[PDB]
Paper text:
Superoxide dismutase-1 (SOD1) is one of the most abundant human proteins and is an important part of our antioxidant, redox signalling and respiratory control mechanisms. SOD1 folding, zinc and copper acquisition, and disulphide bond formation can be catalysed by the copper chaperone for SOD1 (CCS), which forms a transient heterodimeric complex with SOD1 to facilitate its maturation. Here, we discover the mechanisms that govern SOD1 maturation and stabilisation through interaction with the chaperone protein hCCS. Combinations of mutants yielded crystallographic structures of full-length hCCS in two different conformers complexed with hSOD1; an hCCS domain II truncation complexed with hSOD1; an hCCS domain II homodimer structure at higher resolution than previously available (1.55 Å); and the hSOD1 disulphide knock-out mutant used to promote complexation.
In contrast, hSOD1 must be in the disulphide-reduced state to complex with hCCS. Without the Cys57-Cys146 covalent tether, the hSOD1 disulphide sub-loop can adapt to the presence of hCCS Ala231, mitigating repulsive effects. As a result, several strong hydrogen bonds are formed across the heterodimer interface that are not found in the SOD1 homodimer. Particularly important is the hydrogen bond/salt bridge network between hCCS Arg104/Arg232 and opposing hSOD1 Asp52. In this way, hCCS provides a surface of repulsive and attractive noncovalent interactions that mould the plastic hSOD1 disulphide sub-loop into a stable but novel conformation. This provides a mechanism for the molecular chaperone activity of hCCS. The SOD1 disulphide sub-loop Gly51-Asp52-Asn53-Thr54 (GDNT) tetrad motif forms many of the interactions across the hSOD1-hCCS heterodimer interface. Thus, hCCS-SOD1 molecular recognition and complexation proceed by an induced fit mechanism reliant on the conformational adaptability of the hSOD1 disulphide sub-loop and hCCS domain II only. We suggest this primes hSOD1 for reception of copper and the disulphide, before any interaction with hCCS domain I or III takes place.
Numbering used by the authors:
A (entry chain B): 1 to 153
B (entry chain A): 85 to 232
């Protein structure tokens, strides 16, 4: 597909809508939207492997990592495909989101459609924390709100 | 295996459930699920073409119909790919069901939506202007994206 959407929902006040769009085959994917209810600062923003949320974070799994690499930031070469870095919530809790990534895709082996998009509790340290947890989740913390990436018109 | 999926159904009401998909063969797909909070009776179950939950279940679009067919029941060959017929909820409001489909294929519905309606799907036989379009099943009750 060329467009996708995701509605982030959670048990807390965190909630928002994220849009996806890709105009070139295996090209860049524009990721833009809005989230509210967050604490001011940077928050992890990842695509996990599975959209199955029957068990929540357990069934959603780790970061979408088809190439079997270690965690990183979106600008790094050693990264998970689902590694999209941080988003910024202002002093009112609103996170105006705008990302452009070419490792993710709306087609092919790196397709993220049907998977889980999660905004996390803490800020992603981009895999530079010194501990092993940095090489897995970037110490981003627990899931604040999540949603499935579905095909949009 | 040629694909598996799962859809958690939710809406602005008491209806909620979990439906799973498994592509047994290239030409046969297994569909099983359990949905609670339904009024006792028949309820239409359909795959819509957009997994867009930004407006309850209304932004999900029409029945997934890539071949440009008319609405029908599961036993009709001329039917939308997303036409799954009715499921029945018992007196307690629970609808447990298990079906195979020979047109709906898991890889082609990943990212799309699965919706259950308030009324019965007339399978295109109701003699109504909506029969050949939706099945005249009324309002949408709960929906969810078919997830990997
Ligand atoms: Zn990662
Ligand atoms: Zn139909």
């Amino acid at each position: 597909a060329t467009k996708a959407v995701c509605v982030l929902k959670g048990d807390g006040p965190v909630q928002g809508i994220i849009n996806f769009e890709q105009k070139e085959s295996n090209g860049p994917v524009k990721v833009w939207g809005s989230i509210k209810g967050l604490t001011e600062g940077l928050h992890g923003f990842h695509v996990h492997e599975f959209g199955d949320n029957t068990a929540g974070a357990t069934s959603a799994g780790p970061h979408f990592n088809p190439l079997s690499r270690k965690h990183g930031g979106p600008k790094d070469e050693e990264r998970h495909v689902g590694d999209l870095g941080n988003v910024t919530a202002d002093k009112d809790g609103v996170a105006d989101v705008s990302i452009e990534d070419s490792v993710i895709s709306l087609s092919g082996d790196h397709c993220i459609i049907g998977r889980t998009l999660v905004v996390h509790e803490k800020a992603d340290d981009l895999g530079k924390g010194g501990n092993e947890e940095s090489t897995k989740t970037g110490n981003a913390g627990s899931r604040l709100a999540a949603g499935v990436i579905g095909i949009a018109q | 295996n040629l694909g598996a999926a799962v859809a958690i159904l939710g809406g602005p009401g008491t209806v909620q459930g979990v439906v799973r998909f498994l592509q047994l063969t290239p030409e046969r797909c297994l569909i099983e699920g359990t949905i609670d909070g339904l009024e006792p009776g028949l309820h239409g179950l359909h795959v819509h073409q957009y997994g867009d939950l930004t407006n309850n279940c209304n932004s999900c679009g029409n029945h997934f119909n890539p071949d440009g067919a008319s609405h029908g029941g599961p036993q009709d060959s001329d039917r939308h790919r997303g036409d799954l017929g009715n499921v029945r909820a018992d007196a307690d409001g629970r609808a447990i069901f298990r079906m195979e489909d020979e047109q709906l294929k898991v890889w082609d519905v990943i990212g799309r939506s699965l919706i259950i309606d308030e009324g019965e799907d007339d399978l295109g036989r109701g003699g109504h202007p909506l029969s050949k379009i939706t099945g005249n099943s009324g309002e949408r009750l709960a929906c969810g994206i078919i997830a990997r």
